[PDB]
Amino acid sequence: ADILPANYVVKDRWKVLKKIGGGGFGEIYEAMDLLTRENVALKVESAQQPKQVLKMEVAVLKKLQGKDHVCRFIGCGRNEKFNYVVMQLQGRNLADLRRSQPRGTFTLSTTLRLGKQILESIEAIHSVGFLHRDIKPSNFAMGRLPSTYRKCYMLDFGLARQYTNTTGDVRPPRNVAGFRGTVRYASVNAHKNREMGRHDDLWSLFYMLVEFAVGQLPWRKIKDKEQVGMIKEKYEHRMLLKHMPSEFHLFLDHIASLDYFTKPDYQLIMSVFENSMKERGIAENEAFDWEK
Numbered sequence: 442a443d444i445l446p447a448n449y450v451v452k453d454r455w456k457v458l459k460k461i462g463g464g465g466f467g468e469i470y471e472a473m474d475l476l477t478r479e480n481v482a483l484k485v486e487s488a489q490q491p492k493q494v495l496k497m498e499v500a501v502l503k504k505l506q507g508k509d510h511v512c513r514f515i516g517c518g519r520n521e522k523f524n525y526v527v528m529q530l531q532g533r534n535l536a537d538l539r540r541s542q543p544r545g546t547f548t549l550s551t552t553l554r555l556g557k558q559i560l561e562s563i564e565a566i567h568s569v570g571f572l573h574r575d576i577k578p579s580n581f582a583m584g585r586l587p588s589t590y591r592k593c594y595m596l597d598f599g600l601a602r603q604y605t606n607t608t609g610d611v612r613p614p615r616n617v618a619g620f621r622g623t624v625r626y627a628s629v630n631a632h633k634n635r636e637m638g639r640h641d642d643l644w645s646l647f648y649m650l651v652e653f654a655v656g657q658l659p660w661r662k663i664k665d666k667e668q669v670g671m672i673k674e675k676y677e678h679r680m681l682l683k684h685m686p687s688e689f690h691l692f693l694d695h696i697a698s699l700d701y702f703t704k705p706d707y708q709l710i711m712s713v714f715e716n717s718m719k720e721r722g723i724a725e726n727e728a729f730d731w732e733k
């Protein structure tokens with residue numbers, strides 16, 4: 442049922458080595474670039490499959506070229522059987538790296554430094570007029586080169602949505618928008634099927650960094666979407682910060698104050714991370730938990 446067989450060659454250039462991921466919206470392959478001789482990421486979707494995401498992914502990936510924390514764009518194409526995008530291959534995703542930790546926790550050093558990079562990548566996609574809407578650990582990975590192994594990349598844009606027109610004006614929100622992302626990291630606004638805003642990506646970041654440093658979220662073992670939403674709407678989020686740096690109260694307070702229309706203060710949130718490293722002599726050049 443795989444779209445491309447192993448050893449299949451795309452545009453006489455990209456040779457499929459293996460499927461490395463998959464899900465109801467298309468597949469991702471590791472391929473060899475027969476010209477440049479490096480391995481690459483190859484995302485494919487059926488020409489027929491009713492929801493066409495790669496048109497989204499490619500448009501966002503091209504807009505973001507020249508930013509840190511995004512994959513170099515290599516190529517894209519259509520034909521009778523599938524569409525495809527070729528981009529830079531990255532290393533281990535943050536969900537695998539977290540799971541691999543003894544306590545399923547990152548140190549605060551690793552946590553805070555990932556927060557700075559992920560926040561940059563969130564400000565970057567917002568700056569070109571798109572919401573991510575699916576901020577989660579498996580949507581980031583570390584590099585796999587001497588030049589990148591300490592850099593964190595935003596991998597996928599398949600749920601993204603333009604929140605501007607051509608002019609930089611915020612589009613009108615729909616009265617109802619069926620939330621589509623991952624349950625664990627979704628904001629209360631998404632659970633309520635409200636139009637998501639820039640702040641909803643920052644809610645997802647907030648939940649991810651808590652889960653990083655503390656190893657779990659209170660709703661971890663609930664898979665039912667409505668249940669998770671009802672738990673989150675009640676839950677005293679200062680309890681999440683019990684065992685986090687207190688500067689995170691500023692992060693929480695700020696994003697809780699935002700609405701769909703309001704531009705977040707990203708420098709406020711960048712400050713929270715940097716100050717938190719400062720008060721603790723965490724260095725920008727320290728080993729990540731998974732090295733040594």
Ligand SMILES: COc1ccc(Nc2ncnc3[nH]ccc23)cc1
Pocket residue numbers: 461462469482512528529530531532534579580582596597
């Ligand atoms: C096992 O779960 C996975 C999560 C993420 C990805 N994605 C990518 N992996 C590497 N390099 C990549 N460039 C662009 C996307 C991409 C693959 C598998």
